[PDB]
Design a protein around this ligand. Structure first.
Ligand SMILES: [Ca+2]
Lengths: 130, 129
């Protein structure tokens, strides 16, 4: 005989704790430094695994080579802090919420990190405004 | 107007990748060394955030002390490797599967790491037997 059990809510509970840890700045091993014209650089701390889990681009970036130990700082250009903030929040929560006139720029930021699900959703939202 | 989107399956997909990373032994920042009487220590590579997300014991263990630089090796005693394996698998997949006659020792491990859900399921199983 075999005992089996699965907790249906597990991955949502778990992500809830991981997001708490991100906001507390605990266990974080990467800092995203986001530089946008004529405004100060912003910093977002996160966990590489979590970014990897949602984005093949971050996955490739953090499994390639092997970086000298500790806090990695990654320079990001071409994307507003607030777009990156929203992609990060998506990785950690499963949700994103954006002013309708800026959906195009979020989409492009999701393109850049190959977050296909938010690329599609953005796209479908733009197509129903035609 | 506002644009709103949630991907309902996101957290299952993302745990699927995190689990692949664990099995490919990439990005790992902790190696558990599990020692058990008259058997050599077994190693298990995992991601601290992930273990912390599923176990307050792991959470406390990795948030206490200093922001560790790189791979930490951690001695563990009082749990067979295979019990730890199944708890780690549970953390990363939401599922655990064990032969009936060892449910008790799995329950004990889940108590040790304060995985409450698997404690309750193991209890439930042992009472209706
Ligand atoms: Ca408890």
């Amino acid at each position: 005989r075999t005992f089996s059990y699965t907790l249906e809510d597990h991955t949502k509970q778990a992500f809830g704790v991981m997001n708490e840890l991100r906001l507390s700045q605990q266990l974080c091993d990467v800092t995203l430094q986001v530089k946008y014209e004529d405004i100060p650089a912003a910093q977002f701390m996160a966990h590489k695994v979590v970014l990897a889990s949602s984005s093949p681009v971050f996955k490739a970036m953090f499994t390639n080579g092997l970086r000298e130990q500790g806090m990695e700082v990654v320079s990001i250009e071409g994307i507003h802090p607030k777009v990156m903030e929203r992609l990060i929040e998506f990785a950690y929560t499963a949700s994103i919420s954006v002013g309708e006139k800026c959906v195009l720029h979020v989409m492009n930021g999701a393109v850049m990190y190959q977050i296909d699900s938010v690329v599609r959703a953005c796209a479908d939202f733009l197509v129903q405004q035609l």
